């Protein structure tokens, strides 16, 4: 506060690293500075203090290109860390690291701003007990339930409808829990960011003429590393506002988390720090910790993060994913093979995992059903091999009943999403947690052993299954009746 408007002069410029000299003393670290001299620059220049070289000289990282920058150029402190707008006015809008609307859709008109860097919640602010997050999706809420204050790794590239799942989660969370969502594109392709924005406007999650339920914060590849290493924190700050001020269960999507690690690695190298194993920065654990720890469930609200993870060189022991996995409370694997099987959402139930899959957290009935489903699916795989070895008839009555129920389960885990009510034409479903548990519990026992297999395909709940079966039966009867006429 006492350093608001303090004046300094540029002393050194080496790439994206700039040293500033203040006669009155360098401001505190992580402080934001603005270069007043815009002589020939097409964009404003802002620097972030990262180190102190002496009582008067301070090193800083430029968020934009340092072209046309001369020594002794004037610089003015902003009075604190980078400030980002927070509120309900940011919904449906696109921002950058500096919290400037890049959608060219008029002024934001915010009422408040918050610093990018904020301490994580104290031990006394943590939630009393773990709670489940009902996503409205049968597979996620049964075999790998999400947790409030949890970080979930969405393994699996594109071509598997990853964006569709993200949009569905954004819609369902607001629909059920009344919580908003913040998407953070870190080191993301500009083309894909444009496509995502168009899809969101098409699905009405971002209603220009109405009320939106999602914020976007994009730090693209073309931006220097100083921006890609702070865009996530800016988005996280926006979510923190809703978590604390409004007390909601917010969502924070990150695409990807690896790019965040890569950006900090580049920044550390520019400063001249000695890299650690595999060339990563020595502060790899601290950098992630200062971010993930801010993502937790407090007494006021919660922030559940869905982070898209990338494994470099397909090496799961690499320090980046290895350090990341330690902070993940759940895994969601998206596979093309499943999508090519016609199962959307394309999720491999046996490849996923979750830590709240324990009776001490979820209801005992939920745990028992989920384990039974997993066991049946595992047995179904071995029976697939056996029938291939000899044949279907070679299996026992018991095993042949288990190969029928399993196929129904695989078909029943698919679901039509309301986000695709337009481009697919099928009405979406939002299956409740209790409904899913009961539906699967009945199916495992064998109550629905007469329903046709296809009645479970792309349906929500058990009532939908019955309705589809009746329609299929009616259609079959009509066709048979018509055939008898001719």
């Amino acid at each position: 506060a006492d350093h608001k408007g303090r004046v300094g002069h540029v002393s050194q410029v080496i790439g994206a690293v700039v040293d500033v000299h203040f006669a009155d003393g360098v401001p505190p670290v992580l402080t934001a500075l603005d270069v007043v001299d815009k002589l020939g620059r097409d964009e404003p220049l802002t620097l972030e203090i990262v180190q102190h070289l002496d009582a008067h000289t301070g090193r800083c990282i430029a968020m934009q290109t340092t072209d046309l920058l001369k020594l002794k150029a004037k610089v003015v402190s902003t009075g604190g860390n980078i400030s980002v707008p927070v509120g309900r006015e940011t919904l449906g809008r696109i921002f950058n690291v500096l919290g400037d609307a890049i959608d060219q859709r008029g002024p934001v008109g915010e009422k408040l701003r918050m610093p990018i860097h904020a301490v994580a919640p104290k031990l006394a602010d943590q939630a009393a007990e773990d709670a489940v997050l009902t996503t409205g999706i049968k597979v996620i809420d049964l075999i790998l339930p999400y947790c409030k204050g949890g970080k979930i790794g969405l393994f699996g590239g594109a071509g598997v409808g990853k964006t569709v799942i993200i949009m569905e989660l954004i819609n369902n969370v607001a629909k059920g829990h009344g919580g908003f969502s913040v998407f953070a594109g870190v080191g993301e392709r500009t083309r894909e960011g444009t496509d995502l924005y168009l899809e969101m406007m098409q699905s009405k999650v971002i209603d220009l003429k109405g009320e939106s339920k999602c914020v976007l914060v994009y730090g693209q590849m073309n931006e220097p590393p100083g921006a890609r290493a702070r865009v996530a924190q800016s988005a996280l700050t926006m979510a923190e506002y809703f978590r604390d001020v409004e007390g909601q269960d917010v969502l924070l999507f990150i695409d990807n988390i690896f790019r965040f690690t890569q950006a900090n690695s580049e920044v550390s190298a520019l400063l001249g720090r000695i890299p650690a194993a595999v060339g990563y920065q020595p502060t790899l654990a601290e950098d992630l910790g200062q971010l993930q720890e801010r993502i937790t469930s407090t007494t006021k609200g919660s922030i559940t993060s869905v982070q898209a993870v990338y494994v470099p060189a397909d090496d799961i022991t690499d320090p980046a994913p290895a350090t990341t996995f330690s902070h993940l409370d759940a895994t969601t694997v998206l596979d093309r093979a499943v999508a090519e099987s016609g199962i959307y959402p394309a999720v491999n139930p046996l490849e996923c995992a979750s830590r709240i899959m324990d009776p001490d957290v979820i209801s005992v009935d939920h745990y028992n059903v989920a384990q039974d489903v997993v066991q049946m699916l595992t047995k179904y795989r071995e029976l697939q091999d056996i029938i291939a070895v000899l044949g279907i008839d070679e299996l026992s009555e018991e095993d042949k009943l288990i190969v029928d129920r399993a196929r129904k389960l695989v078909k029943f885990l698919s679901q039509p999403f309301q986000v695709a009510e337009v481009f697919t034409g099928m009405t979406g479903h939002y299956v409740q947690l209790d409904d899913t548990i009961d539906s699967f519990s009945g199916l495992l026992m064998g109550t629905y052993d007469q329903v046709p297999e296809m009645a479970f395909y792309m349906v929500g709940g058990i009532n939908s299954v019955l309705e589809k079966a009746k329609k299929m039966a009616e259609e079959a009867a009509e066709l048979e009746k018509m055939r008898r006429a001719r």
């Binding site: 291939a388 070895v389 000899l390 044949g391």
Partner: protein
């Protein structure tokens, strides 16, 4: 680096080996299924041979 690629070449060979052995499994699978009829149809020709 050669040392790294030495392992890569070594792992490359094992991959082809798995595929070929997989092919053998299928070939023998067909002949196993074809010859599985004897199980049903045996045990009656040799009665007075006993």
């Amino acid at each position: 680096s050669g040392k790294l690629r030495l392992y890569k070449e070594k792992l490359e060979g094992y991959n082809r080996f798995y595929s070929i052995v997989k092919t053998i499994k299928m070939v023998t699978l067909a002949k196993y299924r074809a010859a599985q009829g004897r199980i049903r149809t045996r045990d009656f020709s040799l009665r007075y041979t006993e």
